[PDB]
Structure 1
Amino acid sequence: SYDIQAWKKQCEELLNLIFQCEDSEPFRQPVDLLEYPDYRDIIDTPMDFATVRETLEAGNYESPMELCKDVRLIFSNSKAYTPSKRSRIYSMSLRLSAFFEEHISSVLSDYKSALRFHKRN
């Protein structure tokens, strides 16, 4: 269980589960500005799950903490852009965030444990 590289395939599997969740539908592609004309007046750094998957598959994440920061940005952008807490799309973001956090905690713990074991001497 001290495999330093194991997080990558664990993150690919978790992204597959997020793409099967109906709650991911608003977050699978960059927000469309035609529909939401004020989006970049509110959101400095757009993020979505296809961008996360492509960054992972390009080999452009060094750690699962970096992937986790980008996924958390999807959720903080939804909270910043929502006009109410009683919003459909923001409500979907909260359920999807709880699912993501429940599954990513072991991926982070195992990676950090593997790196500590690598430095143990």
Structure 2
Amino acid sequence: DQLYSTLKSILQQVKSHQSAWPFMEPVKRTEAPGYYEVIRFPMDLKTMSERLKNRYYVSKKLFMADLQRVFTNCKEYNPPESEYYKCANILEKFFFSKIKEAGLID
């Protein structure tokens, strides 16, 4: 399947990015005590990798939703000038450039 191959490529490029490090695994409670009382829909790149493997991403829309959720969680939780927020905006720019380069559409 060509969608799977394209999404796998985009996701791995995102994961290899220097600004992806905060988003690689679920936020640990020890890193942010009470995070899971605040953030209703946690998401991270490890979870997305498994979802990709399990053939969840049958559309661009589903893939976009999860990656975008990584960023919105980060911006909802963290101050605008925090390193985490800064990484989210850098990685989001990159993400959208990868979507465009792949020609990924609905």
Output one character per residue of 1:54-99: Cα deviation in whole Å (capped at 9) or x when no partner: 11111122212101100000000000010x2111111011000011
Contact 2:23 2:44 in 1 (8 A): yes
Say which one has the larger Rg.
Answer: 1
Structure 1: which amino acid aligns with 2:88? Answer: S
Number of residue pairs aligned between Structure 1 and Structure 2: 104
Contact 1:61 1:67 in 2 (8 A): yes
Q: Please, what TM-score do these two structures have when normalized by structure 1?
A: 0.80
Greater relative contact order structure (CA < 8 Å, 6+ sep): 1
Cα distance in structure 2, aligned partners of 1:19 and 1:61: 17
Q: Which residue of 1 aligns with 2:81?
A: 86
Cα distance in structure 2, aligned partners of 1:64 and 1:31: 25
The equivalences for 1:93-104 within 5 A come to 93-104=88-99
Cα distance in structure 1, aligned partners of 2:55 and 2:45: 16
Cα distance in structure 1, aligned partners of 2:49 and 2:43: 11
Q: Please, what TM-score do these two structures have when normalized by structure 2?
A: 0.91
Shift in Å, 1:8: 1.4
Report sequence identity in percent. Answer: 27
Runs of 4+, deviation exceeding 2 Å: none
> Any gaps of 5 or more consecutive residues in structure 2?
none
